[PDB]
Amino acid sequence: VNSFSGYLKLTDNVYIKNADIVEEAKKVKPTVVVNAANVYLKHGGGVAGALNKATNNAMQVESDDYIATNGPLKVGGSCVLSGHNLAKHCLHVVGPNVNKGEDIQLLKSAYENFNQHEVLLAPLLSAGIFGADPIHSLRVCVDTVRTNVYLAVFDKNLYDKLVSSFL
């Protein structure tokens, strides 16, 4: 038994809720929150800017030190950093950005990072401003992630469509 509330169960291991990932992290304080990162860990907008804003920019300060030491992530890759005031840990995961020409086949690689963590609060990778089809992203999530994932879908209307079209 964990602390996630009001999620609809899609599979043995995948749960979904129409909710803002920021407000959910603040309430639950999960072990792992997933950020929809880019390879530079430049958290300007979407999940990354909203998560970063909620940390008062401490996520961006930590991230800049990480990049100065290690260089950029790979598309499909990840790193574990602090969760600040939102979670124990933040798993920064880089899904492909369709609005930049990145290979959508890298979405499966991106979701494989989640398998290193027993439980996660996450957004749909490559959905929203990343320009990929969220229905596809949910299918890849269900078919790739084997650990327990709690998906926070921000768009109400999208949430209803994801549930109603789920196979």
- Minimum CB separation of residue 142 from ligand 6U6 in Å reads 16
Interaction between residue 125 and ligand 6U6 (CB under 6 A): no
- Minimum CB separation of residue 31 from ligand 6U6 in Å reads 20
Nearest to 141 by CA among 102, 99, 95: 95
- Minimum CB separation of residue 101 from ligand 6U6 in Å reads 20
Please, are residues 39 and 74 in contact by the beta-carbon 8 Å criterion?
Answer: yes
- Minimum CB separation of residue 48 from ligand 6U6 in Å reads 9
Interaction between residue 98 and ligand 6U6 (CB under 6 A): no
Interaction between residue 21 and ligand 6U6 (CB under 6 A): yes
Rounded CA-CA distance 89/34 in Å is 9
Rounded CA-CA distance 10/159 in Å is 12
Q: Which whole-number Å values give the CA distances from 120 to 31, 111, 167, in the listed order?
A: 7, 12, 22
Q: Which of 128, 140, 141, 142 binds ligand 6U6 (CB under 6 A)?
A: 128
Nearest to 95 by CA among 65, 151, 134, 50: 134
- Minimum CB separation of residue 125 from ligand 6U6 in Å reads 9
Please, are residues 4 and 15 in contact by the beta-carbon 8 Å criterion?
Answer: yes
The half-sphere exposure of 90 on its side-chain side, counting CA atoms within 13 A, is 30
Site string for ligand 6U6, 31-50 (x = CB under 6 A): ---------------xx--x
Interaction between residue 124 and ligand 6U6 (CB under 6 A): yes
20 vs 112 by CB, closer to ligand 6U6? 20
Name 32's bridge partners.
Answer: 89
Q: Which residues bind ligand 6U6 (CB under 6 A)?
A: 20-21, 46-47, 50, 123-124, 127-128, 153-155, 158
